[PDB]
Amino acid sequence: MDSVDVVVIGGGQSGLSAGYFLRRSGLSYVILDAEASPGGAWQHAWHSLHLFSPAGWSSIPGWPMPASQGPYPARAEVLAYLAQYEQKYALPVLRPIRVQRVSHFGERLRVVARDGRQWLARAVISATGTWGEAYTPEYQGLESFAGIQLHSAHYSTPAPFAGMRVAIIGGGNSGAQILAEVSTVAETTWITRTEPAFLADDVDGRVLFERATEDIVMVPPVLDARARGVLAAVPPPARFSPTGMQWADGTERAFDAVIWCTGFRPALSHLKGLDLVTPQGQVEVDGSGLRALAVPSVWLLGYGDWNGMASATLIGVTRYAREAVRQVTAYCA
């Protein structure tokens, strides 16, 4: 049972960012991550994925992302970056470890792994991301649909959908990008809640970051899809049928497959039992967005806007990582 000052849970961009700042502190720490390789959830993104901002705009603290081959970073490059980042700062990343549970051990916290390894931490920084909690909504008659379903989290390639009629549900960047790729081999139908909003052709995802005083980027395959005229959105249906869907007015479309691009929740099963997870799947944090209210020794990092505006982006996590790390450095004194 190692005693450390800080345990960081999750070894993605968020955890590596926390790491960079903890290195410059005087504190003893470790970073626990469940994956086989470095790179967080990017290891699970689909093959064609590219970022929506250039390398300079996709960089975490200190060492920036190397310039990419094309205008936008490819999935591969993001992995290469995050790999080389750990080495560059020789960060204490133990991998693979699945943290099962964090629980009270007197004044400190006890972090337990699936295989019985244990750590004793004065502080914990949860940086586990969202990929692990894919969200599918509940629609009437869904349990009856005979076709194929998957979440965007497991989308990989358009091939399997060749020649099918396919519903893409969700109107974010993901929906748009996957719609773009699947429309190349399938009769496609984009189902969105509100009619989608595209940024301008001459601008990129850095814009979403610039709203940090407090929608979807025209990345090349999206430009292409627009030009092929497949970016028409339709409102949600009313019911699912065994073979398709049905709308308010009674119009019926058949589908062979459905791809849920309906987002994710924070992956905080390891904090259940500390009673920190709200029924909305978040935690209640202080005004800085970072520190948990019900248990002062737990900080959270990188999860999304409730945990800091644009914290769930490469560029935007840096600020909160700094703040979280100086906050805990104070706590350890």
Ligand X SMILES: Cc1cc2nc3c(=O)[nH]c(=O)nc-3n(C[C@H](O)[C@H](O)[C@H](O)COP(=O)(O)OP(=O)(O)OC[C@H]3O[C@@H](n4cnc5c(N)ncnc54)[C@H](O)[C@@H]3O)c2cc1C
Report the binding-site residues for FAD: 13-14, 33, 35, 41, 52, 98-99, 312, 314
Cis peptide preceding 64, ω within 30 of 0: no
Q: Is-contact 166 179, C-beta < 8 A?
A: no
Residue from 18, 51, 123, 300 that binds ligand X (CB under 6 A)? 51
* Partners of 101 in beta bridges: 112
Q: Is 272 in the site for its own copies (CB under 8 A)?
A: no
Closest to its own copies by CB, 110 or 322: 110
- Dist CA 21 CA 37 (whole Å): 22
Answer for which of 6, 18, 27, 32 binds ligand X (CB under 6 A) is 32
- Size of interface with its own copies, in residues (CB under 8 A): 19
Nearest distance in Å: CB 79, its own copies:
16
Residue of 236, 333, 237, 270 lying closest to 110 (CA atoms):
270
Rounded to whole angstroms, the Cα distance separating 9 from 27 reads 16
For residues 99 and 269, give the distance between their C-alpha atoms in angstroms, rounded to a whole number.
9
Hey, which residues between 233 and 262 contact its own copies (CB under 8 A)?
257, 259
Shortest CB 35 distance to its own copies, Å: 11
How far apart (Å, rounded) are the C-alpha atoms in residues 116 and 119? 10
| Distance, CA of 128 to CA of 266 (rounded, Å) | 8
Using CB under 8 A as the binding rule, the residues of this chain from 5 to 44 that contact its own copies are 36
Site string for its own copies, 170-209 (x = CB under 8 A): ----------------------------------------
CB of 46 to ligand X, least distance (A): 7
Q: Interface with ligand X by CB under 6 A: which range of 32-40, 163-171, 183-191, 244-252?
A: 32-40
Count of C-beta atoms within a 10 Å radius of residue 36: 9
13 contact choice in ligand X, its own copies, none (CB below 5 to 8 Å, kind-dependent): ligand X
Q: What share of the chain is helix, strand, coil (3-state, %, to 5)?
A: 25, 25, 50
329 in contact with ligand X (CB under 6 A): no
Residue (129 or 237) nearer to ligand X, CB? 129
Report 250-289 residues binding ligand X (CB under 6 A).
267, 270
Interface residue with its own copies among 114, 193, 272, 326 (CB under 8 A) is 114
Position of tokens 């748009």? 176
x/- map, 206-245, ligand X, by CB under 6 A: ----------------------------------------
Residue with tokens 């589908």: 255
Cα–Cα distance for residue pair 207/291, rounded to 1 Å = 27
Can you say which residues are annotated as belonging to the binding site?
A: 13-14, 33, 35, 41, 52, 98-99, 312, 314
> Binding to ligand X by residue 132, rule CB under 6 A?
yes
- Give the helix ranges, DSSP H, for 100-186: 173-182
Distance of CA 280 to the CA centre of its chain: 17
Any alpha helices (H) in 91-204, and if so which ranges? 173-182
Residue 146 phi/psi, 5° resolution? -85, -15
Q: Is 131 in the site for ligand X (CB under 6 A)?
A: yes
**Quick one: which segment of 33-41, 162-170, 232-240, 322-330 binds ligand X (CB under 6 A)?**
33-41
Residue numbers after which the chain breaks, C to N beyond 2.5 angstroms: 214
Which window, 50-58, 68-76, 108-116, 196-204, contacts its own copies (CB under 8 A)? 108-116
Residues binding its own copies (CB under 8 A)? 36, 103, 112, 114-118, 146, 148, 150, 154-157, 160-161, 257, 259
